[PDB]
Amino acid sequence: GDVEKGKKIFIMKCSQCHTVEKGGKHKTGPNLHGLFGRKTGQAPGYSYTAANKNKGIIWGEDTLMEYLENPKKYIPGTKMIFVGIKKKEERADLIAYLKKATNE
């Protein structure tokens, strides 16, 4: 899975909002380094809402997908703003990069 297709997309979708690299400090949203293999609200440096912090679920390729399709519903009353994604492929590459972005 091409990460690029997920990088650019992650930009036009997640630009100067999220973070992956260590240098990417918490800004608008929480950083994603240990995404794969880490539950939600696992940021002791940035406490989230009571809706997301309650979203006790792992961020996998099976979940990320759904959420990517409709994260709003996935977490109502959240702070994250998004419309969603139609193409399932654009989401794959997105998770194909975020994985290599977080893992790193």
Q: Which of 20, 33, 59, 97 binds ligand HEC (CB under 6 A)?
A: 59
Q: Determine contact, residues 55/41, Cβ cutoff 8 Å.
A: yes
Residue 97 interacting with ligand HEC (CB under 6 A): no
Residue 11 interacting with ligand HEC (CB under 6 A): no
**How many residues sit in the footprint of ligand HEC (CB under 6 A)?**
25
Half-sphere exposure of 67 (CA within 13 A, CB side): 19
Q: Which of 5, 8, 13, 100 binds ligand HEC (CB under 6 A)?
A: 13
Q: Determine contact, residues 28/16, Cβ cutoff 8 Å.
A: yes
Q: Could you give the dihedral angle defined by the CA atoms of residues 34, 37, 52 and 9, in that order, rounded to the nearest 10 degrees?
A: 60
Say which residues have a Cβ less than 8 Å from residue 95's Cβ, sequence separation at least 6.
1, 6, 61, 64, 65, 68
Lay out the site mask for ligand HEC across 27-56 (x = CB under 6 A, - = otherwise). -xxx---------xxxx----xx--x--x-
* Residues making up the binding site for heme c: 14, 17-18, 80
Residues that bind ligand HEC (CB under 6 A): 10, 13-14, 17-18, 28-30, 40-43, 48-49, 52, 55, 59, 75, 78-82, 94, 98
